[PDB]
Ligand binder design. Structure first.
Ligand SMILES: Cc1cc2nc3c(=O)[nH]c(=O)nc-3n(C[C@H](O)[C@H](O)[C@H](O)COP(=O)(O)O)c2cc1C
Ligand SMILES: Cc1cc2nc3c(=O)[nH]c(=O)nc-3n(C[C@H](O)[C@H](O)[C@H](O)COP(=O)(O)O)c2cc1C
Ligand SMILES: Cc1cc2nc3c(=O)[nH]c(=O)nc-3n(C[C@H](O)[C@H](O)[C@H](O)COP(=O)(O)O)c2cc1C
Ligand SMILES: Cc1cc2nc3c(=O)[nH]c(=O)nc-3n(C[C@H](O)[C@H](O)[C@H](O)COP(=O)(O)O)c2cc1C
Ligand SMILES: [Cl-]
Ligand SMILES: [Cl-]
Ligand SMILES: [Cl-]
Ligand SMILES: [Cl-]
Lengths: 355, 355, 355, 355
């Protein structure tokens, strides 16, 4: 019932914007250990670590998602860290066993974000074939069923089109039950979430755009007798005045790296625009939307703490269970969010309950 | 020129013997962090972490090799940790990037042991096809060429029979040059080491058995203009008296687990016995040899510290550059080795220098 | 420089339309042997088989394209027969060797039509992964380069992303140089034709639509220093009067099987509509277009013999080198074409030549 | 039951021996059409067409097995023709459909010989990975189960480690039930034959060597409740005097091409010698044995017609159901076998029946 919060780990060297603007944010482990500790102290339940094999959207350097996640877990106590994984260059036997060992070493705090892929050139560079849009989701669904089965069954057998297991016994299994997240917003993504995943993570959007996705998932999940929760990306710019927050947004966009934005935008046509419906990630993103590379400005958590808290509660009303927050200057703004924004959300929630 | 020492990480729940004998050894992270610190204090330069996906040779539980290596590096300062990797369920793009990130996080202290595989049933359980003996080495050599090329250049291209890369740029690369080890003793293994590897690791053997491998590698490496060093497995039983060490050895063997040894021995026929020459790992192993699952008793580092030190220097004279030590009670025997055996080795080397 | 003619082999039940109308057409070898002999006598240079692995509704039975082509060549003397091949369920080593042997047995009269695929459900049923639209063309281009190299040289080596060859020597090679045709009309198809194919076969279309494809191919092929010819599908309804030919067309469409048409149109969305440009086979086909399953009515070769001859010559004037003809009643209409239509084309061509 | 007879189709340019001796045998279709007709008239029930993709054992040129088998069936009326297929470069969906169409065109007379592979260099040349010996039989068994299922059921589903099918309906199916033969003599081969195949074809051998294989197959097949028949290769040299037949054998061997024989012997080490038991095809073949490349001289059908007929009947007594005959001068020796040897076998069988 209370809304949950995650933050994007800036393990990619350009932060969370495609922009030349000065940021007090770094992609190295030293910066990120302290940020994970600040996020835990601020009240964030999850950190989300993105997966790249090569540079895109202005991230010339990227730390590998699973090892980096392990290091963040080792530096924290209660924080849960979601390691992103792309089927193809990743296989599920290795993923299940590596995640299970990290879970055993971190008191049960690792999770996974299965992402089905859009950056074709990256796959080509690393010798992976490029499956059709919905076919990438068929494979991701077999990957998810494989993870859950390996972790839950003494002797797991799975006779898939992409993956096979035959009486496979993983030991040790995870300490508890790792949560499986997935990223993407196409019909194929919503279908998979309503079947196998614990969480559907989606790009930023208007309230109406989010409600449309939630309503489809809820109906499908109910018919499948499956439980799934909803998280939405938001690039949060909280400042003491609304004018200052809008001025920061304008600086970010004014300083956009246009060659990086356009190259990202071209590659992103292999996500939602390439699905049979032509709907999903980046299908309707302008140059200015792309400057936050998961459409995070659209969620409009930009203004005063009070405006942002009221907007978060309005997202709860259409079925959002978690806000996935990106920031410009991560350490100071995560701390500010915990001191100034999150307590206002909790007060609004207490007042709603007592009525 | 000084001989180097590695120890086997007991990340598999049966320790380093296929036996019911009581051992003060454990496979969990708590035991292994302390063990790694003691090993570093004792003068071991490397720890070697074995790779399993499911139980064999008496190891019902096994921690995943790379994440466990990451954790041991996080708990130490100068120790180098070698993570074992099996091509097939591992792919080189992910290995290259995950190892590069761990390298960056650990001040350049991770290495890799490419092992080409023998446990067919394990591959079948996780959906991997079983290549012919020498073909597994063909694949491993492509895997090693990919790791080395990815780590050393931008725009790496490789048009292999097993792996493809196309203008691939990994960032960040490792801090320096990670060492590539490999395990196996067949002709295919020796040929691969003489072409692409930094270290050839081999099973325990007599001095003459080791000499025959080194001489073959030396000639082949010279013809390729390639440098490779030699490490040999030895199960070290050092006691204050020779009689006590021999009694321990007999206790380990007398308490051998026959189901596990039979099952291991049958599976191990897919290593040296299955090569075109019929030579390599386990091709000549009796039931008693198999109780140490890399033929470690054959190296005969079993006796007083003085006998062991002399035997180590004798191995050096046939071209052994590193002794890879297994133990029964890891923490206490690593400490004893550093206090009682290693200094005798260093004295012998110093006396040989002045002569 | 004379325009060439092919006919579609009705090796799929239901003929060349998705309609319940009575057809004096059959898919068996007896009807098709006689039809091939009639087509050779009528002046057709080629027969084009189609490739299916499964189908529903009236298209319920399909003879395998290569072995059926071999049988048709065995029943004829001069006719060339083009065997359709889909990369994926077909591999290029077997295709090259099987076609070379058939070429040797048939006096050099076999050709191949490389088709890159649109029917996703058929691939899934036979265990094949569904690659993205342009990726299927990347694979088809490697397939074609493989056929051409294997057939033309010993020691053929190819280091593809999809296919590898290592000093492969096929013996015997074909008697002559088999022509490579390809089917498809997207940008990816045109790019491939301008690089590697002898013939670009495309769906039916207006003169304007054909000319736009020819102009793009001609520019690209010139820059590649590559020669490629153009063939266009047309469903030919030649009758003594224009009114009767139009009545037959209305009858075909009026008796269309609506469920079959809709199921075909839904699956065909994986062709042109799924390409990045949204253009290619079936991207703009209405219900009535889909009744001829390669848009054959659009080419408007429906009317008197004189009208049809003038329209064929008009297609030649925009770069069409070959008309690929479908018919309702194959045997009798092939005979009528050779007696009533083809001679008018030749007369028109002769009269143009006298100027 | 009356013993059945097959002959090897000389679809390979060196005939059935690795020798420079002058042979009145040709690999082209004209010689082979007349040969198949003579064999049919002589009383051979089957022809067997070997599969190569590149030159081995002196076969500089090789016609493709399936298309050549189709052409031989087209030249005959009752002869059954067995096309050899190697899983790997062949896939089962295509094999099933192509064979079914040929079966429909030839009145149900096509069969298949599934061979699991020994010629590693050929696979490497055509881009195929080299599976371990027993794993090749694992794949071949899935291939056989797929053929059998596709041919016999609509909506065939098969969830293999090598092949997948999902509700696949092949139409048309064969006219009846095609026979599945397999070649190979290792434990893996015998185990496969005892589970899925109609015929086990084996290399030439002594009576005792054959009986040891039959006895193992019989016990295994009885435990599986499976029916399988036995065929044995024999290189038949029938002459009016024993002295003449022996002189011919000596001439073949004396004119052996020793570079070809040794190169074949080396490649053949990947058959029986590479199996876990070290037993199977070519494991015990001397230089002289290898001159007939399936050990055909060992069966000793070399002598007068009377001697050969008695030795055939003696093979029946250890469970041989079919003799698979090679010859030096094919057309003339097939005609002679039918005039002079086969009638003696029939008289001996008639005399045994009346006792
Ligand atoms: C919150 C979120 C996080 C994501 N993280 C990643 C990532 O780290 N790497 C990646 O390649 N794709 C990532 N994706 C995109 C997925 O690959 C997604 O499957 C792909 O864009 C196809 O999206 P679609 O289903 O909307 O067409 C993410 C998507 C979302 C919504
Ligand atoms: C010191 C050493 C360590 C090894 N570690 C492993 C391991 O952790 N996992 C594994 O499957 N194989 C391991 N192997 C065996 C390899 O997989 C080897 O390639 C296989 O046994 C074939 O050996 P051969 O070349 O002597 O036939 C190791 C071998 C040696 C000598
Ligand atoms: C003349 C012609 C014949 C074709 N024949 C076949 C066929 O026999 N089987 C098949 O699956 N596809 C066939 N196709 C379609 C191809 O699979 C084509 O590559 C696919 O529809 C993608 O088309 P696009 O490039 O316009 O998107 C044919 C296409 C044309 C133009
Ligand atoms: C009668 C017979 C015919 C065979 N024909 C072929 C063939 O045409 N092509 C081929 O590559 N192998 C052929 N083989 C050999 C098979 O590939 C066999 O599976 C391989 O040699 C392994 O044999 P093994 O099971 O005795 O080790 C044939 C074997 C026999 C006994
Ligand atoms: Cl979206
Ligand atoms: Cl060894
Ligand atoms: Cl079109
Ligand atoms: Cl044999």
């Amino acid at each position: 019932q209370a809304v949950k919060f995650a933050y994007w780990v800036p393990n990619v060297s350009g932060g969370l914007v495609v922009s030349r603007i000065e940021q007090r944010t770094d992609w190295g482990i030293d910066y990120n250990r302290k940020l994970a500790q600040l996020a835990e102290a601020a009240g964030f339940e999850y950190a989300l670590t993105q997966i790249r094999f090569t540079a895109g959207y202005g991230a010339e350097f990227q730390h590998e998602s699973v090892a980096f996640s392990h290091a963040l877990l080792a530096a924290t106590s209660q924080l849960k860290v979601i390691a992103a994984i792309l089927p193809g260059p990743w296989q599920p036997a290795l993923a299940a066993k590596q995640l299970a060992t990290i879970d055993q070493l971190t008191n049960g705090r690792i999770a996974v974000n299965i992402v089905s892929g859009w950056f074709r050139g990256e796959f080509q560079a690393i010798g992976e074939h490029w499956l059709e849009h919905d076919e990438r989701y068929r494979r991701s669904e077999e990957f998810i069923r494989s993870l859950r089965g390996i972790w839950s069954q003494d002797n797991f057998t799975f006779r898939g089109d992409f993956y096979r297991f035959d009486n496979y016994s993983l030991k040790p299994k995870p300490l508890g039950r790792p949560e499986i997240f997935q990223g993407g917003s196409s019909r194929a993504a919503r279908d998979m979430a309503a079947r196998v995943s614990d969480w559907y993570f989606t790009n930023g959007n208007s309230v109406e755009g989010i409600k449309a996705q939630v309503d489809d998932i809820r109906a499908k999940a109910a018919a499948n007798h499956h439980s799934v929760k909803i998280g939405v990306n938001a690039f949060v710019i909280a400042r003491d005045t609304e004018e200052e927050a809008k001025a920061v947004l304008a600086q970010i966009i004014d300083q956009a790296d246009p060659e990086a934005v356009n190259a990202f935008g071209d590659a992103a046509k292999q996500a939602g625009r390439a699905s049979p419906e032509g709907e999903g990630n980046w299908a309707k993103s302008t140059f200015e939307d792309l400057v936050q590379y998961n459409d995070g400005f659209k969620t409009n958590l930009i203004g005063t703490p009070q405006q942002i808290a009221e907007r978060i509660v309005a997202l709860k009303a259409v079925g959002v269970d978690l806000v996935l927050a990106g920031f410009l200057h991560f350490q100071e703004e995560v701390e500010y969010f915990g001191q100034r924004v999150l307590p206002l959300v909790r007060e609004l929630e207490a007042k709603a309950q007592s009525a």
